[PDB]
Symmetry: C4
């Protein structure tokens, strides 16, 4: 009886996991790093 609390748990896991994963994939690190670096 607290969707807000559930919102906190789901957004927390989604946030941390989304971050690390977004970082590791294949060449994301080098793709974004080189893209931003002209």
């Amino acid at each position: 009886s607290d969707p807000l609390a559930v919102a906190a748990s789901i957004i927390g896991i989604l946030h941390l996991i989304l971050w690390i994963l977004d970082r590791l994939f294949f060449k994301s690190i080098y793709r974004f790093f080189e893209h931003g670096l002209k």
Copy 2:
């Protein structure tokens, strides 16, 4: 009835939106990197 909880949710949404958007956009990565590097 729970500003604290609302603080958690709003903080999360703002966190993800600012993180992603700030990261991309008009070659933001280069703007932040050049800002810290004077």
Copy 3:
């Protein structure tokens, strides 16, 4: 009395600590930078 709330707490502490240590730790920065630079 609130696994959901308590769970959230663990996620936050784990998030901050994981972030800082992940960055450091035997200069992990170089580990992630070299590994990602396949």
Copy 4:
């Protein structure tokens, strides 16, 4: 009904602030980047 939730608020806002300030404040990116390198 979640004294821990409070800790979640301070840790979350503090986390965000730490990220932004740490990134930009005084050639910080250069400190971490040059630290992991050497």
